Amino acid sequence: SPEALLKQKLDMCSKKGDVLEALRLYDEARRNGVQLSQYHYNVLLYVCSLAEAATESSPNPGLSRGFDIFKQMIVDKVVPNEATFTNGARLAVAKDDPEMAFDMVKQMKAFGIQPRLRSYGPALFGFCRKGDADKAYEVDAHMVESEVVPEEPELAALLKVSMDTKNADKVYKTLQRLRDLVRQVSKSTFDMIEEWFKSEVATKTGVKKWDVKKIRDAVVSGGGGWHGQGWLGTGKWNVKRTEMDENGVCKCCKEKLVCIDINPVETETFAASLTRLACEREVKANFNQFQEWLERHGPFDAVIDGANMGLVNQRSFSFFQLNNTVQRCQQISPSKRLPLVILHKSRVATYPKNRALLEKWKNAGALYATPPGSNDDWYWLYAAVSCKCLLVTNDEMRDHLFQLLGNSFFPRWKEKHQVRISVTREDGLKLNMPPPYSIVIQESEDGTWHVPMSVEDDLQTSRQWLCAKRSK
Ligand SMILES: *C1=CC(=O)c2cccc(O)c2C1=O
Ligand SMILES: [Cl-]
Ligand SMILES: [Cl-]
Ligand SMILES: [Mn+2]
Ligand SMILES: [Zn+2]
Known part of the structure; x- marks a missing residue:
């Protein structure tokens, strides 16, 4: 059978990384009138992603045709499985072009295909590497629309790009998303939050006066342990690595952390x-x-x-x-x-x-x-x-x-x-x-932040926290 033979030969191309042969078989299939299925396309996308991105020439046919193959797969209305999304992302990663990576997710959307978290990665992480916050936030809005919930790496990249473009509002919003979705942060995210609080932009962003009753009501409304009404206080933050005692009391500032229901x-x-x-x-x-x-x-x-x-x-x-x-x-x-x-x-x-x-x-x-x-x-x-x-x-x-x-x-x-x-x-x-407080990023009524590091076993290792408190 012609389709079974194509499958046979593309599988061999995959096993040897023979991209020029896979592209000839794909073309030969067009010339022979052989309809490609889900399986055929998934092998082509994988095979194409093994091609390098060209620094010292115009881009190689491997990645260039790979994107044309992805575009043809979608136009044929072939149903993607989990390997389609994975192999599509490998291609995007190999190309290292976030705009083209973001075009793939836009294509999926235009044909009623639900994109996966890993499809967005090459786009989001590419734009974040370039310091292009505006496109990063477009990719983020696109995720939110498509109801794909970010994980810590996506939030970390959004935080970093917000810090790079001196966007204090976006830093605040991202920290709230970390609180909501991640609760405790990795070492790399913890270090990034510490850098934020010690930064000039953080020092210079704030308000001296606010409505204490609007803060009060947002604390009740949010479930507890945060308010979400913006940066409070002014001036330099005193930022220290510290621990909580067994009752949830910060050893640096003596704030008692709350327990969230x-x-x-x-x-x-x-x-x-x-x-x-x-x-x-x-x-x-x-x-x-x-x-x-x-x-x-x-x-x-x-x-x-x-x-x-x-x-x-x-x-x-x-x-x-x-x-x-x-x-x-x-x-x-x-x-x-x-x-x-x-x-x-x-x-x-x-x-x-x-x-x-x-x-x-x-x-x-x-x-x-x-x-x-x-x-x-x-x-x-x-x-x-x-x-x-x-x-x-x-x-x-x-x-x-x-x-x-x-x-x-x-x-x-x-x-x-x-x-x-x-x-x-x-x-x-x-x-x-169980502890008598919740181990989670907390924001107090006066704008003090406590940020817990994630750890494997908090009985083996003493959990580090960041205490960020305004010096006035
Ligand atoms: C939060 C607060 C608290 O006082 C308490 C006491 C006993 C057991 C718990 O789980 C908790 C709690 O989560
Ligand atoms: Cl006995
Ligand atoms: Cl009982
Ligand atoms: Mn068991
Ligand atoms: Zn504290």
Whole structure:
């Protein structure tokens, strides 16, 4: 078959990086009357993206024809899959021309195609590299219109280009988007925010007088921890790297950070999504059987990830560590409820009194053994969300399938619900409880900023904050 042969030969072109041959096969296909499909185009886009951008000549046919191929693919009305967007972006990156990259996203839009975050990257990051804030903000407006939500790298580039063009309003807006969407910032973003607050433009942007009641109302309206009404105060910012004490009090300025509530409606929506996700990945009847069991049990004050409590910092499963955690959770329960222990059925062992205790927990309504083949993470997570209670795990809950849970609601929920264990020689096992404040960029009523750095494990490493406070 002619289409199957083209596929065969383009696959070989891809495997060898033979761009001049792929372009001859593409043309030969036009001359032969062979219709290209989604798959054919996706190989061509990949193959074309391997061509270099020409510094010492007019651009090479590889990238030049690649953009013509992308334009023809869209004109044919072939449906893009995830490899189309990825390969389209690789081409844009190779060309290193943000205007042409932005033209690709404009083309998609004009033919009713929803662009992906990675399609915008080459455009946004290209314009930001050139210091062209105006085009960067056009690309940003285009994303907002298309409902593609930026991540930290896009916001960081927007912040940097705003700083470069001395645009204090855009710096302010971008910092609010970082607060809203990212909460805690990477090292590179943290350093960039510090540079902003110490800069001349920051020193010279401000207001001496403002309506304290308009600030008050925006604080109530926003959910807490910010107001969004603009830079306040005047003069130089005193900018220090610092820490919060266990109560959320800044060690530099003594401001008490606030605790931001989670709207119960968001929690309901999240619980429904979690249930849907769990049923897609588990055997539906297994997960449903747990849901039915959970409805008949409780109440619970805590849910334990049994595997994690047994295994964290251990060379093999420690019944001691599991059992010590159960006991300690029961002790902090106001009515001494056993925590709900979630374990794999293969665990539920070798010492008779330990097996007897596991069976006693089960008989007390405080243990569920997840079935053969299951991923027990869905079970303890659904349990803690549904019971609105503490979740005891040292799992960071960020990688692999935890990415399916998103980066807005879930990190906020974790912060309020996750209990982690730590062990010392002097004291043994400790429960580390949720903080009494929210670890998020905060803007106070008087215009003081506290910016938290993102870290892997905030019990291992002491989290650095920026305190930016006007010196007058
Ligand atoms: C925010 C404030 C607070 O006082 C508190 C107390 C106990 C448990 C919490 O999660 C919180 C909180 O998130
Ligand atoms: Cl209660
Ligand atoms: Cl005993
Ligand atoms: Mn697990
Ligand atoms: Zn402070």
